[PDB]
Amino acid sequence: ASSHKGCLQLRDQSGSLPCLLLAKHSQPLSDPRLIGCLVRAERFQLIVERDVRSSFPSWKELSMPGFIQKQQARVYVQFFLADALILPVPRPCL
């Protein structure tokens, strides 16, 4: 659970990826005990949200590229906790 925005983030080498759990269909995740662990997920979905802000004059130009002004792209995942597996990193020690 990240300090800046609360949003549950997945973090591993090279960076991070936001996520959106759900305990089970139509019920939310509910115990803090689950922060810290490893979750192995294989039946999941990957999303995007293109936030283009082009400036096309007419429908004609839609055939061309020379009118887009900006671009961004949210990206994140979502899955139930009936599918993924939780693994508790055994408290690291020598």
Partner 1 sequence: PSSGSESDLVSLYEVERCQQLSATILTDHQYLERTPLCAILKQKAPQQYRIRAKLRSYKPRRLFQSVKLHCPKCHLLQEVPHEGDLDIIFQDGATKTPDVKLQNTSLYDSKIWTTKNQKGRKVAVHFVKNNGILPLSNECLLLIEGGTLSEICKLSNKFNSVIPVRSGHEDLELLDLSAPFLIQGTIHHYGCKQCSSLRSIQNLNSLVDKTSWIPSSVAEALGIVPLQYVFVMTFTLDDGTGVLEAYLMDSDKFFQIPASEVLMDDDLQKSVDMIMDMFCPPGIKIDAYPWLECFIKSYNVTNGTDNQICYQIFDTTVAEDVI
Partner 2 sequence: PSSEQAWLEDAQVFIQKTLCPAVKEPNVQLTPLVIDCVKTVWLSQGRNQGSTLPLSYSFVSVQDLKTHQRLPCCSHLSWSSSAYQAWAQEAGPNGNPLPREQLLLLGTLTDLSADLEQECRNGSLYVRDNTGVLSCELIDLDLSWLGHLFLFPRWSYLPPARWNSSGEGHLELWDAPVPVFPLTISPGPVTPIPVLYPESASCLLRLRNKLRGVQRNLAGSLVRLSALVKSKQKAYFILSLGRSHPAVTHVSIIVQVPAQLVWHRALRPGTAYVLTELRVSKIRGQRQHVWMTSQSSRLLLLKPECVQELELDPESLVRYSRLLSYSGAVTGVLNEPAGLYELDGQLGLCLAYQQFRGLRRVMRPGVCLQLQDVHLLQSVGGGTRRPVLAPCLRGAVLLQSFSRQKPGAHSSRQAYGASLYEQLVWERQLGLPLYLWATKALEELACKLCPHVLRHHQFLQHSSPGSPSLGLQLLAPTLD
Span 37-66, contacts to partner 2 by CB under 8 A: 38, 40
Cα 37–Cα 85–Cα 15 angle in degrees, nearest 5: 50
Tell me the two tokens of residue 26. Answer: 């139509």
Note whether 63 binds partner 1 by CB under 8 A: no
**Residue placing its CB nearer to partner 1 in the complex, 19 or 22:** 19
Taking the C-alpha atoms of residue 11 and residue 7, their distance in angstroms, rounded to an integer, is: 12
Range in contact with partner 2 (rule: CB under 8 A) among 1-9, 27-35, 72-80, 81-89: 81-89
Q: Measure the N-to-C terminal CA separation of the chain; round to a whole number of Å.
A: 26
**DSSP designation for 27:** B
Range in contact with partner 1 (rule: CB under 8 A) among 13-21, 22-30, 41-49, 57-65: 13-21
Note whether 32 binds partner 1 by CB under 8 A: no
